Amino acid sequence: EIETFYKMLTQRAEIDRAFEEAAGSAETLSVERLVTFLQHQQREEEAGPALALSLIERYEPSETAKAQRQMTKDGFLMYLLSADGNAFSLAHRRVYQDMDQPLSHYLVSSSHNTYLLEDQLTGPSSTEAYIRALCKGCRCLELDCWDGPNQEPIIYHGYTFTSKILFCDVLRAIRDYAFKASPYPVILSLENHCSLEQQRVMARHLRAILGPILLDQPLDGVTTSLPSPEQLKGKILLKGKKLKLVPELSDMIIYCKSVHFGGFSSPGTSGQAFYEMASFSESRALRLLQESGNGFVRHNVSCLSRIYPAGWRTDSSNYSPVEMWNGGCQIVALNFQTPGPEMDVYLGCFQDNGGCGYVLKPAFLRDPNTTFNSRALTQGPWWRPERLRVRIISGQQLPKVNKNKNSIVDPKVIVEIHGVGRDTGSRQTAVITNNGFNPRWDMEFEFEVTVPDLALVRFMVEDYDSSSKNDFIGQSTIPWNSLKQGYRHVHLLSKNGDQHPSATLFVKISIQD
Ligand SMILES: O=P(O)(O)O[C@@H]1[C@@H](O)[C@H](O)[C@H](O)[C@H](O)[C@H]1OP(=O)(O)O
Ligand SMILES: [Ca+2]
Numbered sequence: 001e002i003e004t005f006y007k008m009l010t011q012r013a014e015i016d017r018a019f020e021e022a023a024g025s026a027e028t029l030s031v032e033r034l035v036t037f038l039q040h041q042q043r044e045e046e047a048g049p050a051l052a053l054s055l056i057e058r059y060e061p062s063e064t065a066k067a068q069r070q071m072t073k074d075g076f077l078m079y080l081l082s083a084d085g086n087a088f089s090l091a092h093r094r095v096y097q098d099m100d101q102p103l104s105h106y107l108v109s110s111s112h113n114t115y116l117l118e119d120q121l122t123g124p125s126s127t128e129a130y131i132r133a134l135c136k137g138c139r140c141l142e143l144d145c146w147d148g149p150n151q152e153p154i155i156y157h158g159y160t161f162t163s164k165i166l167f168c169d170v171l172r173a174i175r176d177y178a179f180k181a182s183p184y185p186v187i188l189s190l191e192n193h194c195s196l197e198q199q200r201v202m203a204r205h206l207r208a209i210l211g212p213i214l215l216d217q218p219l220d221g222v223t224t225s226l227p228s229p230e231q232l233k234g235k236i237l238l239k240g241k242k243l244k245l246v247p248e249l250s251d252m253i254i255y256c257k258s259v260h261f262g263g264f265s266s267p268g269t270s271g272q273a274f275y276e277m278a279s280f281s282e283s284r285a286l287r288l289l290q291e292s293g294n295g296f297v298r299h300n301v302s303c304l305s306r307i308y309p310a311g312w313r314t315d316s317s318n319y320s321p322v323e324m325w326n327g328g329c330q331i332v333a334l335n336f337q338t339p340g341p342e343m344d345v346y347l348g349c350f351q352d353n354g355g356c357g358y359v360l361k362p363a364f365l366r367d368p369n370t371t372f373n374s375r376a377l378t379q380g381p382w383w384r385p386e387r388l389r390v391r392i393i394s395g396q397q398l399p400k401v402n403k404n405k406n407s408i409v410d411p412k413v414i415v416e417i418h419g420v421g422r423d424t425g426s427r428q429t430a431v432i433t434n435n436g437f438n439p440r441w442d443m444e445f446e447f448e449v450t451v452p453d454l455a456l457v458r459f460m461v462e463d464y465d466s467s468s469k470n471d472f473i474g475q476s477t478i479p480w481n482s483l484k485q486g487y488r489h490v491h492l493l494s495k496n497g498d499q500h501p502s503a504t505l506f507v508k509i510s511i512q513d
């Protein structure tokens, strides 16, 4: 009984079967079989006794089997729940890409009106908001500066009733957290509304507070392109207008001069200097993407574009970043304080590359001479269809999505493909009523994706309500190239992007060309 219970509360058939199938009849998995599993199933490339051994060394609970270079079912399970059994590639969870190209070549995690904790009209601002962002990996932050009492510049939403905070205070927080999450450059987007006096003050605080972190002079060399995240490692750069504007400030804008969108210079040689940056609202961006997809892309190859939520999003709601990333846009600004699929995809995207905040664009988005246009797809390197088959097997300890009572969850799972439009798909499972502890669905979906290099796969679990909406329970977004194959567990996240210790989905992923 009491064993039978812990034994029976804790008894997952899917796992048994999986171990069975792997080990065949043996009560154990020999390296020879482990490796077969690692290869045939988990489709690992580095599959080999080396891997298999580290797996066992790392996960095998039995001192015997461990010592005897073997894996018992338990050890199998643990691996499966480990950072190694995770659907989101462990390898990709550390900086592993080329940090040498000019910034324009990377997608940069960017925040919008960062100082805000809520809505854009009357919610509050706080330095906490910049801390959070920074802790969530954000590299590019926004400071809307306005003159304040006692000659001290303040930051708040120009023309609204949003609460205020000090320019200096913000500067310290940034100073303190700019690199907690990553060594790479942080970009400060100044939106100056300050009298010349207070402007200078600003300039003082910057120098005073950022000190040496501040990048106040062009990098020796750095002549034809933007520096690389490597070159700027440890610095913070300013972005704003460059010569109503005191030189103290303007003299600090080195590689990020705000500019009004000129146009894309294919019908010429140049347009915006690599050191010039344009911003575009959601709407405009779409339009240009709709009309000049290839223009933009090519543009974005050597220039940084910043996009920002549409004016009507007074609720700090966000738009989808994918659409812009698809155009090579790199400083895709979102309202970091707002839970939703948009931040889910955003943060999923940036978990890649050890979440350093910079993610190398695919090559075809880094070739000045590119005919790509996610909107008018033609054959190109980017064109590389794959067939994804995802099996939603079971759920484990799905969290009680609050609810002001003792009810049980009634879960269902949605899997979605995000990328070029042609590739967008969504599918959902059935609801298992009244089970969150160990719902088992065993449902499989299949998707065709022509442009994996821009895709992301999202797993979301809602608690079904016949009556009401459908309570979000947890979610997880994995970029296509970090999607791991075989049996894996998807570690679910709360709406706020926090890790849910024991909430997981157990799945079988298979990708074939
Ligand atoms: O920092 P930029 O690139 O200028 O973009 C900002 C944007 O991120 C946000 O403040 C919008 O509310 C605002 O309308 C816009 O400024 P705007 O008044 O120039 O449109
Ligand atoms: Ca702003």
Ligand SMILES: [Ca+2]
Pocket (backbone or CB within 6 Å): 407, 408, 409, 410, 433, 434, 435
């Ligand atoms: Ca129920």
